Amino acid sequence: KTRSSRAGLQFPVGRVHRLLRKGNYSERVGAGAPVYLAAVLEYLTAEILELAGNAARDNKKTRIIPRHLQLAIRNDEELNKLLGRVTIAQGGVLPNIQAVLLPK
Amino acid sequence: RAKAKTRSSRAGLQFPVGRVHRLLRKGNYSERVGAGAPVYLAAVLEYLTAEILELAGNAARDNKKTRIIPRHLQLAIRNDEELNKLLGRVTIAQGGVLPNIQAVLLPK
Amino acid sequence: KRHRKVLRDNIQGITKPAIRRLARRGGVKRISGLIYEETRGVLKVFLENVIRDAVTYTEHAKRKTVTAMDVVYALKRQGRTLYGFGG
Amino acid sequence: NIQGITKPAIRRLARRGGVKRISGLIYEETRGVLKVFLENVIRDAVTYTEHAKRKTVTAMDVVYALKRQGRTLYGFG
Amino acid sequence: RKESYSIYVYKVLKQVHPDTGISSKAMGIMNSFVNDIFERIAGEASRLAHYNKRSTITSREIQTAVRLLLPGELAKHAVSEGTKAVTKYTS
Amino acid sequence: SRKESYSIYVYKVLKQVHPDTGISSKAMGIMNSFVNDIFERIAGEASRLAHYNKRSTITSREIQTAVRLLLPGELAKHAVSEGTKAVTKYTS
Amino acid sequence: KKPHRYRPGTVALREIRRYQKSTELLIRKLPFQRLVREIAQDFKTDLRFQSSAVMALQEACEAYLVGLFEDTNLCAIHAKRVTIMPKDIQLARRIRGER
Amino acid sequence: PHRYRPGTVALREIRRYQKSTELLIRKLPFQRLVREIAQDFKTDLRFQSSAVMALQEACEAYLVGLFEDTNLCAIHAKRVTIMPKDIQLARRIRGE
């Protein structure tokens, strides 16, 4: 039986534990810490994929591509805040024209 | 036993090599620490301290003050391009700002 | 067991002449009447973020008194390192 | 070689930035800015390469250089 | 060899969008993302442990670090997921 | 209650560079904050260097590369010169 | 005879010189403390504060505002005005990346 | 002959280039510039292809962001044409 299975998670708890042990972060690691961390990472992954899927469906595409990820991130205030200083390669920018530039 | 010599003295330094070594061991930066690393680090820290104190002393004498106070440190830091770059995001408490008025605001 | 008067409207303690003085240090010569409310809002936002982080640190240590070190760490992790309050 | 960053390319970049009209003097200024940016990044990148005692700059070298200047880049790990 | 989160990303994707796929580049970007957030959280946790002179990183430190890095609603939901996961694991 | 600081070393350096100049308590505290800040930056950058290259030991080489990364230009060259001279004198 | 009355701007400039020469804190201690305690109370009730913590917070707040006013002034001057206005503050904060 | 008014094609280009994501500078001159600059720090360096593509993504993203801020600065002064002083103001406020 795996610890991820006992925890109801998809992300690999064991691997996260090994990466913490070898990442020179602290002398000891509690048993609950990698479970908590794995849960948080899985939650955030689900949030981003949710929005990116929505953006893909608006674009009538069945596969999420980087463009959809950039659109998803920049259109969500809290994610945009979290990734304010991150560049998504091949992401482009949000469609946006300043009102003063339009005629009339 | 051999007479005690300090590593700082062996290196011709003023900063405490032993203490820096202890802080590296206990700062969880790496599993192992080479014998030469704390000497180098101590030398760099001492040099930078000397540079800041040099500029601050100059500023202190320009203001006809004999004791360096925080105001002099702020003046010293902002008037040197490379230190200003290094400490671009640092606030010096009780430092104030450099005297500076935009030219367009003065009368004609 | 004799607590202070409940705090209200303390944003008004940031007076008009104080903001003017701060602007003077920034080199500002003339100031529109609408500046003051805007400044108050900006200051409030800044303060909120700092105090939030400080209190988070205070709770992690299971203490009830926010210390100077708590504030220094909060500021440091927002890229506004402050010198003078260590030790 | 700085002239290989042509005028129409900078115009296209500005279009993506939403700029509608562009003074003739912008282009030279832009080139200068670009040069400075590149220099800094490359200076750090080569440093990593040199630390590893390698002669080939890798993608990872660039990613680390960019990260330590607060311009984290996704996609090249 | 070269580890990635690809299979876990795919399982999550199938949970949230059964009929959606993903390009190779997008999966690479997701891996970069996961590693980034991992490093941030572990580093913040490290500072937390040092400040309080504790030698053990526990789930409580993780929780405090999460409260510091994520804004508002994201933080609350993350805390909720972490608490449920620890409670389910413990029993 | 024993709290270590760099005060005595700062004072010795001050006497080397400005024999008749003093320093207020606040300024000495600021110097301690400064020294700790640069220490943390350098040690952290060195840690990342060591990690990237799968080496378990931080040596003077990592310190030197970190120094080149953090300090600008002439400040970096002078610091590197001081460190190298100091290490070579120490080794003999 | 007519009372002495400097023209608009003279005293402002003299104040700029005056306050850039000195370093003392410019907001009153106690109202600032009350502000901090009020804001703090909306996260957790009954917190206490060390004195030096409040003084540190005050240094940080005033330094932040001073920097914001430098940038605001540059933005105002760019538009060939000499009076700073709310849109200048909003531009400065947008470019810093806070909004 | 038919002629579009000044600005119409500019707007069309804005929509066009904000809709797509392909790199906008030619690969080879960019590479040549990179190698020339690199040559002034250490001789005989080579580069992996993906390193150059990464550098190009970073450079173009940086410039795009700078042009957004520049445009905001231009509009602030009630102009529609960006000028060098606008770039210098933007760069000063970013802290470079």
PDB file of C-alpha atoms in Angstrom, chain G residues 31-87:
ATOM      1  CA  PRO G  31      -1.896  58.201  16.003  1.00  0.00           C
ATOM      2  CA  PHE G  32       0.304  55.929  13.962  1.00  0.00           C
ATOM      3  CA  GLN G  33       0.356  53.401  16.790  1.00  0.00           C
ATOM      4  CA  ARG G  34      -3.432  53.494  17.000  1.00  0.00           C
ATOM      5  CA  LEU G  35      -3.665  52.931  13.254  1.00  0.00           C
ATOM      6  CA  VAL G  36      -1.398  49.900  13.485  1.00  0.00           C
ATOM      7  CA  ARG G  37      -3.356  48.419  16.371  1.00  0.00           C
ATOM      8  CA  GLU G  38      -6.694  48.962  14.635  1.00  0.00           C
ATOM      9  CA  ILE G  39      -5.513  47.248  11.449  1.00  0.00           C
ATOM     10  CA  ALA G  40      -3.909  44.435  13.448  1.00  0.00           C
ATOM     11  CA  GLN G  41      -7.133  43.809  15.353  1.00  0.00           C
ATOM     12  CA  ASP G  42      -8.878  42.708  12.189  1.00  0.00           C
ATOM     13  CA  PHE G  43      -6.630  39.648  11.984  1.00  0.00           C
ATOM     14  CA  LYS G  44      -6.325  38.503  15.608  1.00  0.00           C
ATOM     15  CA  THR G  45      -7.786  40.098  18.710  1.00  0.00           C
ATOM     16  CA  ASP G  46      -5.832  41.152  21.804  1.00  0.00           C
ATOM     17  CA  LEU G  47      -2.354  41.227  20.267  1.00  0.00           C
ATOM     18  CA  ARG G  48       0.295  43.254  22.043  1.00  0.00           C
ATOM     19  CA  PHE G  49       3.273  45.027  20.499  1.00  0.00           C
ATOM     20  CA  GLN G  50       6.849  45.755  21.467  1.00  0.00           C
ATOM     21  CA  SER G  51       7.764  49.430  21.150  1.00  0.00           C
ATOM     22  CA  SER G  52      10.668  48.852  18.778  1.00  0.00           C
ATOM     23  CA  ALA G  53       8.382  46.874  16.486  1.00  0.00           C
ATOM     24  CA  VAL G  54       6.160  49.890  16.007  1.00  0.00           C
ATOM     25  CA  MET G  55       9.154  52.140  15.474  1.00  0.00           C
ATOM     26  CA  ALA G  56      10.455  49.748  12.821  1.00  0.00           C
ATOM     27  CA  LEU G  57       7.083  49.706  11.089  1.00  0.00           C
ATOM     28  CA  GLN G  58       7.091  53.473  11.072  1.00  0.00           C
ATOM     29  CA  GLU G  59      10.508  53.643   9.456  1.00  0.00           C
ATOM     30  CA  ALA G  60       9.365  51.225   6.772  1.00  0.00           C
ATOM     31  CA  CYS G  61       6.137  53.076   6.049  1.00  0.00           C
ATOM     32  CA  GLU G  62       7.730  56.482   5.756  1.00  0.00           C
ATOM     33  CA  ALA G  63      10.583  55.241   3.567  1.00  0.00           C
ATOM     34  CA  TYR G  64       8.088  53.540   1.263  1.00  0.00           C
ATOM     35  CA  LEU G  65       5.995  56.681   0.950  1.00  0.00           C
ATOM     36  CA  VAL G  66       9.050  58.862   0.301  1.00  0.00           C
ATOM     37  CA  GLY G  67      10.075  56.635  -2.577  1.00  0.00           C
ATOM     38  CA  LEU G  68       6.554  56.697  -3.947  1.00  0.00           C
ATOM     39  CA  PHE G  69       6.586  60.488  -3.908  1.00  0.00           C
ATOM     40  CA  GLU G  70       9.866  60.648  -5.796  1.00  0.00           C
ATOM     41  CA  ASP G  71       8.424  58.511  -8.558  1.00  0.00           C
ATOM     42  CA  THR G  72       5.136  60.416  -8.501  1.00  0.00           C
ATOM     43  CA  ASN G  73       7.023  63.683  -8.941  1.00  0.00           C
ATOM     44  CA  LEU G  74       8.912  62.305 -11.917  1.00  0.00           C
ATOM     45  CA  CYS G  75       5.639  61.195 -13.479  1.00  0.00           C
ATOM     46  CA  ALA G  76       4.081  64.612 -12.942  1.00  0.00           C
ATOM     47  CA  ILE G  77       7.057  66.422 -14.468  1.00  0.00           C
ATOM     48  CA  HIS G  78       6.963  64.114 -17.478  1.00  0.00           C
ATOM     49  CA  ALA G  79       3.493  65.433 -18.333  1.00  0.00           C
ATOM     50  CA  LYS G  80       4.803  69.027 -18.204  1.00  0.00           C
ATOM     51  CA  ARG G  81       2.840  69.728 -15.031  1.00  0.00           C
ATOM     52  CA  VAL G  82       4.229  70.767 -11.664  1.00  0.00           C
ATOM     53  CA  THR G  83       1.339  69.620  -9.462  1.00  0.00           C
ATOM     54  CA  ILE G  84       1.006  65.945  -8.625  1.00  0.00           C
ATOM     55  CA  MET G  85      -2.435  64.409  -9.094  1.00  0.00           C
ATOM     56  CA  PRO G  86      -4.014  61.027  -8.305  1.00  0.00           C
ATOM     57  CA  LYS G  87      -3.473  59.698 -11.815  1.00  0.00           C
TER      58      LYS G  87
END
